[PDB]
Design a protein around this ligand. Sequence first.
Ligand SMILES: Cc1ncc(COP(=O)(O)O)c(CNc2cccc(C(=O)O)c2)c1O
Ligand SMILES: Cc1ncc(COP(=O)(O)O)c(CNc2cccc(C(=O)O)c2)c1O
Ligand SMILES: Cc1ncc(COP(=O)(O)O)c(CNc2cccc(C(=O)O)c2)c1O
Ligand SMILES: Cc1ncc(COP(=O)(O)O)c(CNc2cccc(C(=O)O)c2)c1O
Ligand SMILES: Cc1ncc(COP(=O)(O)O)c(CNc2cccc(C(=O)O)c2)c1O
Ligand SMILES: [Cl-]
Ligand SMILES: [Cl-]
Ligand SMILES: [Cl-]
Ligand SMILES: [Cl-]
Ligand SMILES: [Cl-]
Ligand SMILES: [Cl-]
Ligand SMILES: [Cl-]
Ligand SMILES: [Cl-]
Ligand SMILES: [Cl-]
Lengths: 286, 287, 287, 287, 290, 286
Amino acid sequence: MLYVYMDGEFVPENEAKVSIFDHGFLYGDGVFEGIRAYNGRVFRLKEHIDRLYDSAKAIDLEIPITKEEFMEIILETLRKNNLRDAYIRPIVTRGIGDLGLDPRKCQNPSIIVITKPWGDLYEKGLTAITVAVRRNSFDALPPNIKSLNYLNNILAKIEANAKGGDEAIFLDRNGYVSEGSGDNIFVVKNGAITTPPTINNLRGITREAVIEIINRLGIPFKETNIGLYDLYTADEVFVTGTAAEIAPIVVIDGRKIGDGKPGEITRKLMEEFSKLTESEGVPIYE
Amino acid sequence: MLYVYMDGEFVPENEAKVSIFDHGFLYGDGVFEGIRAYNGRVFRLKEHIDRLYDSAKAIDLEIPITKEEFMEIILETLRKNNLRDAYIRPIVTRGIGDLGLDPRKCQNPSIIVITKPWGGDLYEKGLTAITVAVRRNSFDALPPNIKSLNYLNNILAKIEANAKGGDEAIFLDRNGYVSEGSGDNIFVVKNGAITTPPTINNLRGITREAVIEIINRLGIPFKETNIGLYDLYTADEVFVTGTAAEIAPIVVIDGRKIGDGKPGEITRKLMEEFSKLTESEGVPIYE
Amino acid sequence: MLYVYMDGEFVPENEAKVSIFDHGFLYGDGVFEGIRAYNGRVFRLKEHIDRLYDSAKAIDLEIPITKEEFMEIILETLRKNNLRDAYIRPIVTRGIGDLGLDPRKCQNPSIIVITKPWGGDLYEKGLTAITVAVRRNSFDALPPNIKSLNYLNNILAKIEANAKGGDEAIFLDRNGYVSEGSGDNIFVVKNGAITTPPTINNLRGITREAVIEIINRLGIPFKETNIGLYDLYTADEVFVTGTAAEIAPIVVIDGRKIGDGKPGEITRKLMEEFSKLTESEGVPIYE
Amino acid sequence: MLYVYMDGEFVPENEAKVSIFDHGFLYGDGVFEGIRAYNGRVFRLKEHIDRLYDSAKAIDLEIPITKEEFMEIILETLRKNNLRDAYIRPIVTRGIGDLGLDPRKCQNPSIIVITKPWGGDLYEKGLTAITVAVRRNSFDALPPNIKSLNYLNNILAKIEANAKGGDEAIFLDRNGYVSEGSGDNIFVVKNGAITTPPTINNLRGITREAVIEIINRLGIPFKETNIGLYDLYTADEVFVTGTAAEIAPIVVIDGRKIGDGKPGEITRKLMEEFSKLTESEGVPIYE
Amino acid sequence: MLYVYMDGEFVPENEAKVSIFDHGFLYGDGVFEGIRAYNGRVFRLKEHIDRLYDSAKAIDLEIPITKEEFMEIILETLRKNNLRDAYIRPIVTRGIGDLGLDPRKCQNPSIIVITKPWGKLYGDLYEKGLTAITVAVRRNSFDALPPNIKSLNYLNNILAKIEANAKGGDEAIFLDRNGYVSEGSGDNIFVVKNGAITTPPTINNLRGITREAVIEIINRLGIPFKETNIGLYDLYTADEVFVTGTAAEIAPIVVIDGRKIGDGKPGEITRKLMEEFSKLTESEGVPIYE
Amino acid sequence: MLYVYMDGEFVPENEAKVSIFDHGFLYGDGVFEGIRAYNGRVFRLKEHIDRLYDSAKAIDLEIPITKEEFMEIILETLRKNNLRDAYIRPIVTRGIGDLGLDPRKCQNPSIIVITKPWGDLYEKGLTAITVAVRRNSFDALPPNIKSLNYLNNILAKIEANAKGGDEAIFLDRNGYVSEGSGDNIFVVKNGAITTPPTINNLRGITREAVIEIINRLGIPFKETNIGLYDLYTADEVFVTGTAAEIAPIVVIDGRKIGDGKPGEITRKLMEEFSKLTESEGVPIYE
Ligand SMILES: Cc1ncc(COP(=O)(O)O)c(CNc2cccc(C(=O)O)c2)c1O
Ligand SMILES: Cc1ncc(COP(=O)(O)O)c(CNc2cccc(C(=O)O)c2)c1O
Ligand SMILES: Cc1ncc(COP(=O)(O)O)c(CNc2cccc(C(=O)O)c2)c1O
Ligand SMILES: Cc1ncc(COP(=O)(O)O)c(CNc2cccc(C(=O)O)c2)c1O
Ligand SMILES: Cc1ncc(COP(=O)(O)O)c(CNc2cccc(C(=O)O)c2)c1O
Ligand SMILES: [Cl-]
Ligand SMILES: [Cl-]
Ligand SMILES: [Cl-]
Ligand SMILES: [Cl-]
Ligand SMILES: [Cl-]
Ligand SMILES: [Cl-]
Ligand SMILES: [Cl-]
Ligand SMILES: [Cl-]
Ligand SMILES: [Cl-]
């Protein structure tokens, strides 16, 4: 039924498998992206591919095809599955080597493209908890790299699951707010919006699009460090990501945020973002 | 030719593959061990299996078989490949779920056992090391005590070592203390006394534990305490420990000769004692 | 129907009030203790009073009576209320001054002694704990070794625990190491050995000290060393210690069952030994 | 002579007392503000009340009256004492509960309003400051943005300043950056440009906000950015801002003369502009 | 042959010596500057002297002459050696005292001016670009030994240089105590990505005079510019990286930690800034002889 | 009147000068020791020389003579000045090179030996203040290296001078007590003695000798991290170093330590240390 691109061939989902000797599996030595197709268009495809190549460069991995080729493979995979509204997960691995860690002994990076169809939480908003684990440090395992090492994020999610939150919020190694387990975070206070600099989190493509909207609407905006206090006393909080789009956060660590309902600025940004996704993107067909 | 245990079946190496939808692959959401078989015996098998289950507990992953069953599967895999001297890599994954990170959506952890035959001139001369710019993953972020499939921090250090002329990389931690090598624990020898970092910022090495037993048996003064760059540079001897490496002497750090630049007397003594231990101890594969 | 000692007079509870201009109220500028009376004896009275004077010294506050006088006032207050089993809360404040924070403007520290009667289904089943996002007050900012009226750090942790399904909150410190619970010290049991953090990032608990004496008397291997999240999650047993709590088992941390999820054998043994200690030791209230 | 608002009644100063069982006293579990009345007007009353409610939200405390009601109570208290020039200290406490720290056991928060008359030579000459060894309470432990009854960190800094020859203490934060004074925000002037730390490691000062409005109106180059010890020592001018202090010049830091050792031209200009602002703005007390 | 100014006298290089009891030698208790003369002009002389006095103020050292006097001494030293293109190193020491560290026991700070000829024997010395490595040692903290002070305490920088020498880099790059990029062992660092330029704030490094001049050029050219914290990731994934300093001018960095930066050659924006900076040095400065 | 050893010759003090082009002067690129001669004996000469060579190794500086030769030069310098009670300051510099920082360009390290004669505050004790500056980090400029870079120590001393302390006390980059500006620190509480581990400070030779005495006397002793709280609430505090020997600290940050007078354990250790200095050491003459 659904086909996965894997190293030059289309392979059914149930058969899409990688060698256990690939360093992408043994050590999470690889990179990935998350991309959305809306109404036959791929939203910000080029931006995602640029980021995929930056992630690879950061881990000294050479992607064995060009950006143009990678974009064509993504479009082809969507076509092959006849999708118009989808989630796309391109993955590049280090490849098979010996059982040590040396990446120089790895040959043939694998290229994989997964496409899956995409068809109360936003009306009511999400509950969040701040986690005890800090985000992976920008001087240890830089979170700006979207790699197959996502266990830091998973530990945060496990905490949220056990602690009554829909979402986990990280602080960084220096005590500053970082991001959610899988999304960037924005704070609204007295009509002005703040978001952390991207060094301790990930340069979100949704985040970038939302900042463009914010500036277009003339809402006062500042990229600056935020703390627990700013989260708790905010008028509104929301998170941004490819899968989530814009999700309101209405409770943090048992405290109602503002009136406890998705806020007016958040709702306005949600509308504007929907508009953007309906009118922009690389066409899949024709 | 060589068979891998994978979820109840023996599968040839070239066919040993995991679903790309397993969270072990998508997110490195899984745990592993490294174990050695010497002369038909598996060295410290129980200790490694205890640590595998601790790694799983740390990431809230339930291993779907008992420790006894896991040990039998390891022995069976070695038997199936007729090995007497081998490296063993058991792996447990979170399993297949959807494309989000939530582990609650994953069912059926995979159980995998890799066994590869095993049979140094670098040990006569010793290794060169460099200290890396990247710090070790924090014990309050992604605890390095967990032996997980998230090894990119270690790989980044190895990439630095490759580019900077070192056979091995040495990490400092988030607080500026010496941690470990990219894949081994680290020991410093100075004026007849040995120091090693506490295990919080690194990994509770089974080789490290065995070497400490030897050290205490020999009556060499020993202290588990924080060490710094200064202690590395001014050491009489430095060595690293791990399953694959055993005991490897480090004779140059950041361009500085360690002592006389040759593997030291205490290191050599510990290397001999450790060889003896591996030849006389372990769970028998065949008898 | 209970009397409180307040600056030389015995005052009924409903009338026990402090000026809003006391810096102890305006700024939490004061120190306190928590002490238990068991069967007509005050457990470790002298140790608690020594710590009260150390807390005061740390904040440069001069307690205007001697330790001997303070002990007599505590005994008198218990007598006046005819208590044999009680919780005692001595408090010393900076005193009344102007509306600035300068302690030089404050003249007459207040001395207060509260005694309340004391007469554990959660101890059969054990407590659930969650690790909090807030770190403990730093030992280079507002040292937690000072038992002061500044307890908002502890309250924020408790608020997190209340919202996040834990009976107790566990803090990490400014450097990523485990510190303590919101109101108790923490111990980890693993393979028959016990570890607890050094006291610098937490509080030199009198219960903690008594439990360490028991541990050493029983010959259980014991080490004071830094502990991390990993050590909590993979422990055989965890327990917390304090005056009010005594020894409380922790059986779930951050959704993970600790060992078998029931109070452990070593914990239960220490609980018994500690009960024995409280029944046979202490400064007698009567005669 | 002077009356304090306390839970619905006016009470003379000498009788204004709080139960020792209020958590505001036992644990400093409460919030406060500092507000000035100038010539029958309350300067930035609404801003202070907004911040009071934000402080309460941060510690999960529900103030049991509306902001409008709180403002009326403040005006009423000033009227009752016939004040035109005053310092106002509203306080909200967690309330009486049991002797544990759990705020869920507390029922009835207390509402308190203190008003004291107000109405120099240190401002012509400027103040001496010393940087303290204690760091400011961390924004990830006990956020300094909360104006709470936990002021012992500030008091420790003041004690250091008293012992070390400074009129004021200057804090660095947990990451080594300049934070603020023990009771005021800090600004640096260098080559005609002004810098001040971001507010995360200190307090969002209402005076600070008013001074930034003046700075921007005057077109003085201004940047909110991290400052270090070096920037303090080599500044042309330094000043601090707060409700009680207004704008105070700092002319010596750690034994070093700042610029020429006298209040600087930009500081003096800002002092004039700020006086003007206080004379022409505010919520009228009478009529 | 070359004369050094030392406390009021001109002294030949081979005789230019300081008492071993000067605290500047015993403890590195002193301050210095690095200044260039181009075609008979001293580039940004006043800015360098202002920074020298700020360094001294930071270590509570009173320079015993005025800024105007110091500038005249520098010009005089260049004249005495008949230089038109030179490197200038003014130094002020704490002075001679006893063998303890207390600076109160020191009298008479020494004033020293070194001038050495400078000849770019080839233009296009940075045609290929430099290789860099990030070091394990962090930069001296802004709350311990502030790097904004250009003092005689340069051992942190030397340790980084030793690492670079042993690890195959022409230059060392520091991170700071909080994990942020700081600077090179002797130069400020800039990152170019998608036509925009970033550089760290100056708190964890040094307020470079070259850095300041390059920022003026950047703004004049209308290149998007932001002063903000940068991490290892930003270095590795940059289109271009360059470093700035008095001696180096603008030096391209084309490899970091074994990774080619962009195409591995000095980048277009870097080359443009190098041209503009050369122009600036040819047309500005305090005249030595005029 | 007094002669300084400088690169093979004895040179009068007033003429003892180093080239301004030596990197030891330009960049503080060199190492030093502090040693005492008592009654014609040099106390712990070998330990000091071992530490000098360790400092040099730490900065990758090769001392161009052997330890035995260095010891002889020290003895010779003392003899030449006819001293019996003295302070000795050996110094090794990187040497002359060009004006850059690269140590590869420096060829001939200088060897210098300074010897100066040696002969109420200990009866009353010293006042100390804790400084705002942290000690140089063990991951930046390791304080275990006794180098010519002493400006961190000088900044602390400047703070102490301005803030009414005879001595400055440092905390480290992680908030733990480190040492004084020129001495190690010990805390006495309820008959037991604590001192920080040596990683964040310097492996003091006096400190080592005092620990030997402590153990010989059977006083309970522990090497562990100490905080501000432990300083303020101590029964006794003292500092140790070559010049200071054992100095009691009786006031810290305006707080009287115990009764404000040198304590019983401190006084006992001062006596025992005097005894040690009278009966041990390498003889200068014969
Ligand atoms: C980070 C780390 N530290 C220490 C050890 C040593 O532990 P044992 O003494 O128990 O083996 C390990 C485990 N050693 C390990 C794991 C994976 C790869 C490699 C390699 O050398 O390439 C080494 C490890 O992965
Ligand atoms: C850590 C992190 N932060 C931010 C984002 C948002 O980036 P974009 O705006 O470019 O998508 C991501 C990406 N979002 C992401 C990726 C993988 C899984 C999940 C999940 O919700 O389970 C979320 C991410 O993984
Ligand atoms: C830590 C702190 N920082 C800044 C300010 C200034 O904020 P406003 O500009 O909003 O006033 C304050 C408030 N100022 C304050 C509060 C309580 C006591 C004292 C005192 O100086 O004794 C001072 C404060 O307590
Ligand atoms: C930073 C530091 N720490 C400890 C000591 C004590 O070490 P020994 O016990 O090995 O001497 C020292 C050495 N003490 C020293 C050196 C130079 C000057 C001054 C001064 O107080 O003016 C003091 C030192 O400089
Ligand atoms: C640490 C540091 N950072 C930046 C600069 C650049 O500042 P100007 O742009 O103002 O020059 C310097 C100064 N550059 C400097 C000083 C001394 C030696 C060396 C060397 O590279 O060998 C370099 C420096 O020493
Ligand atoms: Cl990390
Ligand atoms: Cl900030
Ligand atoms: Cl340590
Ligand atoms: Cl803190
Ligand atoms: Cl530790
Ligand atoms: Cl900054
Ligand atoms: Cl530092
Ligand atoms: Cl930042
Ligand atoms: Cl510790």
